[PDB]
Short mmCIF file of C-alpha atoms in Angstrom, two decimals:
data_model
loop_
_atom_site.label_atom_id
_atom_site.label_comp_id
_atom_site.label_asym_id
_atom_site.label_seq_id
_atom_site.Cartn_x
_atom_site.Cartn_y
_atom_site.Cartn_z
CA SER A 1 41.08 11.54 6.55
CA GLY A 2 39.42 14.17 4.23
CA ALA A 3 36.26 12.50 2.75
CA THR A 4 33.21 14.77 1.97
CA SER A 5 32.57 14.63 -1.83
CA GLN A 6 29.05 16.19 -2.10
CA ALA A 7 28.87 15.00 -5.79
CA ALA A 8 25.82 17.27 -6.51
CA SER A 9 22.62 17.33 -4.32
CA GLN A 10 21.08 14.24 -6.06
CA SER A 11 23.24 11.02 -6.31
CA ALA A 12 22.32 10.17 -9.97
CA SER A 13 18.78 11.64 -10.62
CA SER A 14 17.58 9.39 -13.54
CA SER A 15 16.23 5.82 -12.74
CA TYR A 16 15.34 6.17 -9.03
CA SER A 17 11.70 4.86 -9.48
CA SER A 18 12.74 1.19 -10.02
CA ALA A 19 15.57 1.51 -7.41
CA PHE A 20 12.91 2.80 -4.91
CA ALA A 21 10.78 -0.32 -5.64
CA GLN A 22 13.89 -2.51 -4.92
CA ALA A 23 14.39 -1.08 -1.37
CA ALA A 24 10.62 -1.43 -0.84
CA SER A 25 11.32 -5.22 -1.12
CA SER A 26 13.98 -4.82 1.68
CA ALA A 27 11.18 -3.96 4.18
CA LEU A 28 8.54 -6.20 2.47
CA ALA A 29 10.88 -9.23 3.05
CA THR A 30 10.92 -8.22 6.80
CA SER A 31 7.05 -8.45 6.78
CA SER A 32 5.98 -11.91 5.38
CA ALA A 33 2.41 -11.29 6.73
CA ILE A 34 1.86 -9.08 3.57
CA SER A 35 1.74 -12.29 1.43
CA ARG A 36 -0.83 -13.48 4.04
CA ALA A 37 -2.93 -10.32 3.29
CA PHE A 38 -3.06 -11.50 -0.39
CA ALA A 39 -3.80 -15.09 0.82
CA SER A 40 -7.02 -13.57 2.39
CA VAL A 41 -8.32 -12.32 -1.07
CA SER A 42 -8.60 -14.78 -4.02
CA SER A 43 -10.01 -12.30 -6.64
CA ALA A 44 -8.16 -10.09 -9.20
CA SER A 45 -10.67 -7.17 -8.95
CA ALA A 46 -10.78 -7.40 -5.11
CA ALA A 47 -6.94 -7.14 -5.06
CA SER A 48 -7.40 -3.91 -7.15
CA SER A 49 -9.77 -2.74 -4.34
CA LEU A 50 -7.11 -3.80 -1.73
CA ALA A 51 -4.53 -1.62 -3.57
CA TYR A 52 -7.02 1.32 -3.63
CA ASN A 53 -8.04 0.84 0.08
CA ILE A 54 -4.56 0.07 1.55
CA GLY A 55 -3.01 2.69 -0.81
CA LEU A 56 -5.24 5.45 0.69
CA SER A 57 -4.25 4.21 4.21
CA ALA A 58 -0.47 4.13 3.40
CA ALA A 59 -0.91 7.61 1.81
CA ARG A 60 -1.41 9.01 5.34
CA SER A 61 1.38 6.79 6.86
CA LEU A 62 3.86 8.46 4.39
CA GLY A 63 2.02 11.89 4.46
CA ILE A 64 1.19 11.96 0.67
CA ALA A 65 -2.66 12.11 0.92
CA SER A 66 -2.56 12.58 -2.97
CA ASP A 67 -3.34 8.81 -3.27
CA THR A 68 -6.42 9.79 -5.40
CA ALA A 69 -4.08 9.39 -8.43
CA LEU A 70 -1.80 6.69 -6.85
CA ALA A 71 -4.70 4.31 -5.93
CA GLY A 72 -6.21 4.93 -9.42
CA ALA A 73 -2.89 3.54 -10.86
CA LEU A 74 -2.05 1.00 -8.04
CA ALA A 75 -5.40 -0.76 -8.71
CA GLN A 76 -4.28 -0.87 -12.42
CA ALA A 77 -0.80 -2.18 -11.42
CA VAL A 78 -1.99 -5.00 -9.03
CA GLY A 79 -5.10 -5.66 -11.23
CA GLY A 80 -3.09 -5.56 -14.52
CA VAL A 81 -1.53 -8.89 -13.29
CA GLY A 82 -4.52 -9.90 -11.08
CA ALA A 83 -4.34 -13.73 -10.68
CA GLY A 84 -1.66 -15.24 -13.01
CA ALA A 85 1.81 -14.42 -11.56
CA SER A 86 2.06 -14.25 -7.66
CA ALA A 87 2.38 -11.88 -4.66
CA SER A 88 5.76 -11.12 -6.43
CA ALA A 89 3.91 -9.36 -9.32
CA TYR A 90 1.39 -7.81 -6.85
CA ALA A 91 4.24 -6.46 -4.62
CA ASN A 92 6.42 -5.39 -7.62
CA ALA A 93 3.39 -3.72 -9.29
CA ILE A 94 2.47 -2.09 -5.92
CA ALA A 95 6.10 -0.95 -5.25
CA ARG A 96 6.73 0.24 -8.88
CA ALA A 97 3.38 2.17 -8.93
CA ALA A 98 3.84 3.44 -5.32
CA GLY A 99 7.20 4.65 -6.71
CA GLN A 100 5.81 5.94 -10.10
CA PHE A 101 3.94 8.79 -8.34
CA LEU A 102 6.61 9.44 -5.63
CA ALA A 103 9.21 9.62 -8.48
CA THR A 104 7.28 12.71 -9.76
CA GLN A 105 10.10 14.34 -7.60
CA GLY A 106 7.59 15.56 -4.90
CA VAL A 107 9.28 13.42 -2.16
CA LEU A 108 11.85 11.35 -4.13
CA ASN A 109 15.27 13.13 -4.41
CA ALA A 110 17.68 10.37 -5.69
CA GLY A 111 19.33 9.76 -2.25
CA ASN A 112 16.41 9.03 0.15
CA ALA A 113 14.47 7.06 -2.56
CA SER A 114 15.47 3.71 -0.96
CA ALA A 115 14.82 5.02 2.60
CA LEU A 116 11.30 6.29 1.72
CA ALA A 117 10.67 3.06 -0.26
CA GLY A 118 11.57 0.79 2.70
CA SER A 119 9.31 2.95 4.93
CA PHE A 120 6.50 2.94 2.27
CA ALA A 121 6.68 -0.83 1.80
CA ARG A 122 6.69 -1.45 5.59
CA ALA A 123 3.82 1.11 5.99
CA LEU A 124 1.59 -0.22 3.13
CA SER A 125 2.41 -3.76 4.38
CA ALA A 126 1.78 -2.76 8.08
CA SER A 127 -1.58 -1.38 6.85
CA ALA A 128 -2.34 -4.63 4.86
CA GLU A 129 -1.15 -6.87 7.80
CA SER A 130 -3.30 -4.91 10.34
CA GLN A 131 -6.17 -4.74 7.79
CA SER A 132 -6.25 -8.60 7.98
CA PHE A 133 -7.91 -7.80 11.39
CA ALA A 134 -10.48 -5.44 9.65
CA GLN A 135 -10.94 -7.58 6.44
CA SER A 136 -11.91 -10.67 8.54
CA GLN A 137 -13.81 -8.70 11.28
CA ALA A 138 -17.00 -10.66 10.25
CA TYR A 139 -16.84 -12.03 13.87
CA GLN A 140 -16.42 -8.55 15.50
CA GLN A 141 -19.43 -7.05 13.59
CA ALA A 142 -21.48 -10.08 14.87
CA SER A 143 -21.28 -8.47 18.40
CA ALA A 144 -20.26 -4.76 17.94
CA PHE A 145 -22.31 -3.82 14.78
CA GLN A 146 -25.36 -6.03 15.66
CA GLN A 147 -25.79 -3.91 18.88
CA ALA A 148 -25.33 -0.71 16.75
CA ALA A 149 -28.21 -1.88 14.38
CA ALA A 150 -30.35 1.02 15.86
CA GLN A 151 -29.09 3.49 13.12
CA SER A 152 -31.24 2.17 10.18
CA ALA A 153 -30.30 4.60 7.34
CA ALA A 154 -30.44 2.53 4.08
CA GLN A 155 -30.29 -1.22 5.00
CA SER A 156 -28.22 -1.98 8.21
CA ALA A 157 -24.41 -2.15 7.62
CA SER A 158 -22.49 -1.27 4.37
CA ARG A 159 -24.24 0.08 1.20
CA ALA A 160 -23.46 0.70 -2.54
#
């Protein structure tokens, strides 16, 4: 047959950051419970905190613990359109800003951009979807933390 055109190491190497955020949607559409994670939080600034929190969790699911800068821009992406568009703007702002740092070229190489994006989107969504269990754990603390109320350090549970 004779078909092995390498065509350089990188497929196109120019506009991979938006094309990443498109294949993110390929896995996000497989995981409708992510829109349910946003249905749990009805505040623009708290969605910025969800991006910072779930960003730092997804950081470790992808291996890029450098979320210190990502989360500081992901909060500005989700919060920049906090309550006015939809989970479409939250997910596009999350996937574009998830991509904006990865597209520094540190892990994105214009050939596995879509593969890493699908995995990122499924991992940040799997974190958000499983964090619905830790966001609404107000019932679990009312049995597990109330018995641990013997470690009085500042008030009882959560501070500042």
